[PDB]
Structures are given as C-alpha cells and as structure tokens.
Design a protein around this ligand. Structure first.
Ligand SMILES: Nc1ncnc2c1ncn2[C@@H]1O[C@H](COP(=O)(O)OP(=O)(O)OP(=O)(O)O)[C@@H](O)[C@H]1O
Length: 337
C-alpha cells in the first residue's frame, strides 16, 4: 500500500487494463463464451465482450486496479521498470484476430506480435512469484469473508478445499492463473515496458527449524560396553546425507555438546569432510545417501580408522590413521550424532 506507482507506469496502466479486458474478449469468444450480460459461464455467457463501459466501468477500473497492484507487487518483490523510449511505446506490429478469437464489436485487441517476445528463466521465476502473491491475496480475501480449508467444497460451512499453499494447489487452477498472469506480463512487455530483472537474490534458511532448541541427537552405547583393549569394528549407515557424525567417545561425553568439539569424543563429520577432536581438520571424502561408514579402533597401539563403502579414508596427507595418539582412559564406546 505504501508503494507509489510511478507516472511512467500509470500512463500505460490504462492500456494495460484495456488489454486485460481484451483478454477476456479474445479468450471467451474463442473458447466458446458468447455474449451474455450475466456471468453465466455455464451456458457460455460473456459480459466482458464489449468496450470498457458496457461491461461495468467499475469492473473496467477494477482492471485498472489489477494493473495498479500488479505492478505494485512487481515493486514490492523488487522488479524494476525499463523504458527505452516512446518510440518503443509506439512499436506495434498489429497482431491480427479472426472472428472466433475476436470480440464482436470494434474494441479490437491488437497490441503486436507477442509470439517472439521471450522471457528470461529468472523473469519466469518472478512471474511465478507474482502468481504466488495473487493466490495468497485471493486466499486471504476468502479468509476475510470467513472461508476455510477442506477436502470437499461446502458453501454452507464455508469450506473451500482450494484454500491451500500455492505449492500444493491443484494444477488446473494453477495453470489457469499462471498462464493468465504470464499473458498479463506479455501485455506489459508489448506496451514497451520491459523489466530489467532484479538480481536473483541468493539465500538459505540453513534447514534449522527443528524441535524447540535441539540441534542434534547423540546415540551412544551403554557405558558398561567400553573397550580398553583389542580391535573393534562397527558400521554406520547413512540413510540421508547431511549433518551427521560417527566415531568413538569416552564414557563422559555430554549429550548436549557437539561430537568432537571437546576431548570427550573422536568423531568423523562426512557432511563437510572433517575429523573432530577438540576441533575440525580436513579428512576423508563426503558421503551420500546409502553410504556405509566403517569405524575401526585398535586400543593396543591407540589408532583409529574410517572406511567409506569399503575404501579407507585418509588425511590431507597419505596417512591412513585418523587418530593416532590418545590415552586408553576409561575405554571407548560407539557414538553417532
Ligand atoms: N466478473 C468477473 N469476471 C472475471 N473475473 C472476475 C470477475 N469478478 C471478479 N473477478 C476476479 O477474477 C476471479 C475469477 O475467478 P472465477 O471465475 O474462477 O470465479 P470465483 O468467483 O473466484 O469462484 P469459483 O472458483 O467458485 O468459480 C475472481 O476470483 C476475482 O478475483
């Protein structure tokens, strides 16, 4: 609402709403809706099939406002307007209509040959976000009327199943509102205004919206299973690649501390390929989904090793050992974060 429409944009706003009226005339007279004063689309009735006024001029100015808040959505997302010159405004290669795709009267739609005008993939992304915003506006307006989500439609209970996030919206309404807004962007382009696309801003939510304040879940064996001598082996299977660690920990590891951040554990972080004991150092490769890590500890000579899908992981140098100088302490138990 605080966004003010530039004069550049508003002096062609009128032609934009005119051509959206022209979109009803073309689309309805082509797909079969003939002229009808009431919106009885069931029996192919079209009230929008005539010049601005005879279809309610309040609806024509509603199209004016559709252009207004559409370009305001462009500025709110950050889509800029690009004008070269009023000669580019006058540039029209008058696109021709048969009577089937043309309205009965002389309010003839003919901007230009929109076929060759193309969209950047980023531009299509912003157009899809425009459709997103329009769908949210519609759904919230329905909420203002007092509607709600459902699986079957009941106007008595005001339960529309279509009230869902746009990602889960049904593809039929989805393609209709998409291609409609795509054509609206085509209209804006054919009236000279091209958009100098805003930079595709890069971001990431870090996938950290877990249960309350938890960030990891440490799984260890019982403290009475600690091994102080011999050679031992266990496998860790990676179902989903991500922030996971595996290794051997002392029988004093704190459940709320990240594995390897202290002296109480010896872990392998294959997400970013480090080795964790009081700090991180580059080690080994990075796993994928279904990868199996094999942890091997030999307390006789105090060494540790890791294997990804059979092959031994090595350090930055050619050393096979992952941890080679540590005391026996109270033993070690398998652990994974
Ligand atoms: N007379 C009109 N002709 C075309 N679009 C209109 C008209 N009045 C309002 N609109 C806008 O265009 C949309 C067209 O939606 P549509 O034709 O599918 O019907 P609806 O009233 O939204 O509901 P339904 O999906 O149940 O038919 C409306 O939701 C509204 O935003």
């Amino acid at each position: 609402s605080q966004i003010v429409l530039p004069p550049h944009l508003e002096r062609i706003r009128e032609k934009l709403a005119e051509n959206i009226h022209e979109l009803w005339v073309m689309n309805k007279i082509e797909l079969g809706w003939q002229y009808g004063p009431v919106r009885d689309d069931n029996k192919r009735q079209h009230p929008c099939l005539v010049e601005f006024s005879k279809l309610p001029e309040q609806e024509r100015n509603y199209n004016l406002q559709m252009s207004l808040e559409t370009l305001k959505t462009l500025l709110a997302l950050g889509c800029h307007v690009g004008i070269s010159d009023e000669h580019a405004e006058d540039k029209v290669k008058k696109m021709k209509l048969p009577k089937n795709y043309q309205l009965t009267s002389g309010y003839k739609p003919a901007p230009m040959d929109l076929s060759f005008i193309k969209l950047t993939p980023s531009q299509e992304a912003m157009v899809d976000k425009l459709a997103e915003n329009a769908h949210n506006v519609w759904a919230r307006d329905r909420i203002r009327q007092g509607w709600t989500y459902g699986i079957q439609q009941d106007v008595k209970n005001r339960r529309n199943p279509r009230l869902v996030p746009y990602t889960l919206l049904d593809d039929r309404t989805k393609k209709s509102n998409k291609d409609s807004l795509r054509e609206a962007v085509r209209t804006l382009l054919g009236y000279g205004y091209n958009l100098e696309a805003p930079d595709q801003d890069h971001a990431a939510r870090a996938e950290v919206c877990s249960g309350t304040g938890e960030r990891f879940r440490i799984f260890r064996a019982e403290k009475t299973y600690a091994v102080k001598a011999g050679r031992w082996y266990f496998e860790f299977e990676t179902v989903t690649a991500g922030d996971m660690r595996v290794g051997w920990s002392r029988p004093g590891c704190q459940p709320d501390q990240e594995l390897g951040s202290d002296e109480r554990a010896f872990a392998f972080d294959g997400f970013k390929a480090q080795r964790w004991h009081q700090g991180n150092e580059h080690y080994g490769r990075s796993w994928q989904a279904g990868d199996v890590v094999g942890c091997m500890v030999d307390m006789n000579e105090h060494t540790m090793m890791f294997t990804l899908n059979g092959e031994i992981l090595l350090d930055d140098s050619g050393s096979e050992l992952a941890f080679k100088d540590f005391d026996v302490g109270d033993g070690f138990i398998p652990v994974c974060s």
